[PDB]
Every structure is written in structure tokens, then in C-alpha cells.
Amino acid sequence: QERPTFYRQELNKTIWEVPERYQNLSPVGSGAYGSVCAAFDTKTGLRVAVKKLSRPFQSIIHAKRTYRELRLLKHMKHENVIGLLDVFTPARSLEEFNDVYLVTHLMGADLNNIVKCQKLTDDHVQFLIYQILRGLKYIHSADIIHRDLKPSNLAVNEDCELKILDFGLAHTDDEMTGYVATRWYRAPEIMLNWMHYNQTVDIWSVGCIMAELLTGRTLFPGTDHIDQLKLILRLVGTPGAELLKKISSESARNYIQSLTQMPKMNFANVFIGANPLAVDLLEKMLVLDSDKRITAAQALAHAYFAQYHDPDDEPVADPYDQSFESRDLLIDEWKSLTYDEVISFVPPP
Ligand SMILES: Cc1nnc(-c2ccc(-c3cc(C(=O)NC4CC4)ccc3C)c(C)c2)o1
């Protein structure tokens, strides 16, 4: 409708200009999330997170990624998936449009914080993984791949309710180097660029996360890519003939064949004392050949989630047109598209 009144403040060397409805902005994440503040939305009574994009139209790559994040956020309407509460710019025209602010729920913590600082019963694990899978079914149904699912991008409130963050944005080589959580959840096919990957990479990550919730320990805490691969192959076995043929990277194929063949281990011996149904599901997620991993929709129907599974309450997404991903456009063209998306935004019911 009408343009709200905006007010300005400096928050860590940066000037935030936001509608009056948003009060008590304070930075959050310790830099980790980007440039993000928590706030109180006096209009809804919700605690919100506000991300200010940093000079978003500085290159074609920045402009396109700004548009991509906004498109993604606008599309996602699911309880277990972060969605857009509001998007604004103080700009009164396309000519002056140069900052984008995205508003979402503030859950209050991430899973990293939880699995570090609390004791998780088998029931907690069931509920947390059920929700990630319910969110992923939705995401994958729109032909979106997370690609970087890990504890730190699972946002969780005090009732253990969960929303997935950061899907579809796909890190520098440096960030993925060494003993780092940034690589510990990645499917091997993506870690070592074995082949054209798909949504199945996300299921590997869920297996890694679920294992960690059950044991309180990182499943594959490799010191580097090669050490991580060795940790992985020790648990799930070395690839067989069928999978080797699917590694299109002649280079990666050649290297993996240099390794001594190892059989898949007994998961009941690896996950001592765990619910046999949890062990069964982990076996179905942690399959080296991505073609053979359980899908999110298949997983929701697995006996481990009998207590939460409701097939009438696991919605899919409306079609997501991502044809823009193949498009080469100028900065001003990506910017104008982003502007149209800001201007046309209608807040949720
Ligand atoms: C703590 C705590 N509790 N909740 C949060 C939190 C919630 C939402 C966000 C958030 C996520 C995306 C995102 O996932 N974009 C990609 C397109 C998907 C975009 C904007 C925001 C504010 C952030 C950074 C933190 O932090």
C-alpha cells in the first residue's frame, strides 16, 4: 500500500534504514550470517531476523545472486523452510534502488547450538529429522537443491520446531579446506566433483546430521578432503563397478580405484544402542551411489517416524520457474528484475 516511514541507525559501521514497525535492532550471528539483525516487528508481534544485502548490484554475479535469494525466499511457503515475512528498500524509484532488506522469522538458535548444549532423546532425534525431511520434501518438490545442509543452517526455536535456511545459494576452496564443519556434511560426489550431482546430495547430509544427533559426535570429521573420503569409505565401503561407471570424472574415477577395497561396515556395531529403526534409516540415507539413496518423500513414510508421519500434512511446493539461472543479463537488468520482485511482494496471511 502506502510507503511506511523509515528511520536510520548505524549498526556495526553500517547504516540501516528500516520501516518504523521494526524496533530494537541488534546485530546477530557474530558476523556468521552476513549482515543480520534481530528485531521486534511491532506490527505482527514477531521476533524477526533482518538481513541487509551488502551493495547487491556491484557485479553481474552479485546482482544475479541478489535476485536469486529474493526469488527463493518469495517462493518458499512451508513450516520447516525459511520464508519471507517482508522485503523492503528505502528507495522511492528504480533509479535510487541500491539496498535490499529481507525479513524472516527469528527462530532463536541453530542446531549446532542445540546438539552442543543439550541432551537429545531418540524422540528429539525423530522430531528434528522428521522436520528436516518434511522441509526437504517441499524444497526438492520445487526442483531446488540445498547442497549445503548442515547443523548451522537449521534454525530451531525453544519448542524444537525447525526451519531450513540457505538452500539453493551454493563456498571458496579455502572455506572448504582442512578440519572444517563446512565440508563434513557434504556428499562425496559433490566433495570430489565425481559427476553432475542432484537433490540426492541433500539426503547424505541428513544422514550425517542424524548420526551426529544420535551419537553427539560428527560422523565424518575429516581433516581434509582425502581424509574425509577415507572416513566415508571405511563406513560405507569402496565403490563397486556400477558406481565407478557413473563417476564421469575420469580423474576422480582413476584415483578412487587406487584405494584398497573395503566392505560396508555393520551399522548396528557402529551405532551401538541406537533405535534399530534409526540404524535402518541411516543405512538407507548413507548410500554411496546417490541413485540408490532414500528420497525425502520415501523417508517420511519410514517406520522411524510413525509417531509424526502424516501423509495429508507433508505438502509439496507450487512450480518454481528457475529459467533465469540459464540467462545471461546485464547488471541493470538483474537489478530491475529484483526491483519488480520487491515491489510486487505481498506479505503472508
Ligand atoms: C539465531 C537465529 N534464529 N533464526 C535465525 C535466522 C533466520 C533467518 C535468516 C535468514 C535466512 C535467509 C536464507 O536462508 N536465504 C537463502 C535463500 C534461502 C535469508 C534471510 C534471513 C534473515 C537468518 C540469517 C537467521 O537465526
UniProtKB/Swiss-Prot annotation:
Which compartments does it reside in? Cytoplasm; Nucleus
Phenotype upon changing residue 179 to F: Loss of kinase activity
Reaction(s) catalysed by this chain, per the record, are: L-seryl-[protein] + ATP = O-phospho-L-seryl-[protein] + ADP + H(+); L-threonyl-[protein] + ATP = O-phospho-L-threonyl-[protein] + ADP + H(+)
- List cellular component terms (GO): cytoplasm; cytosol; extracellular region; ficolin-1-rich granule lumen; glutamatergic synapse; mitochondrion; nuclear speck; nucleoplasm
Relate the outcome reported for changing residue 177 to E: Loss of kinase activity
CDD domains membership: STKc_p38alpha
Task: Sum up the protein's function in the record's words.
Answer: Serine/threonine kinase which acts as an essential component of the MAP kinase signal transduction pathway. MAPK14 is one of the four p38 MAPKs which play an important role in the cascades of cellular responses evoked by extracellular stimuli such as pro-inflammatory cytokines or physical stress leading to direct activation of transcription factors. Accordingly, p38 MAPKs phosphorylate a broad range of proteins and it has been estimated that they may have approximately 200 to 300 substrates each. (Microbial infection) Activated by phosphorylation by M.tuberculosis EsxA in T-cells leading to inhibition of IFN-gamma production; phosphorylation is apparent within 15 minutes and is inhibited by kinase-specific inhibitors SB203580 and siRNA.
Concerning its family, UniProt says:
Belongs to the protein kinase superfamily. CMGC Ser/Thr protein kinase family. MAP kinase subfamily.
Name used for this protein in its record: Mitogen-activated protein kinase 14
Q: Which gene encodes it?
A: MAPK14
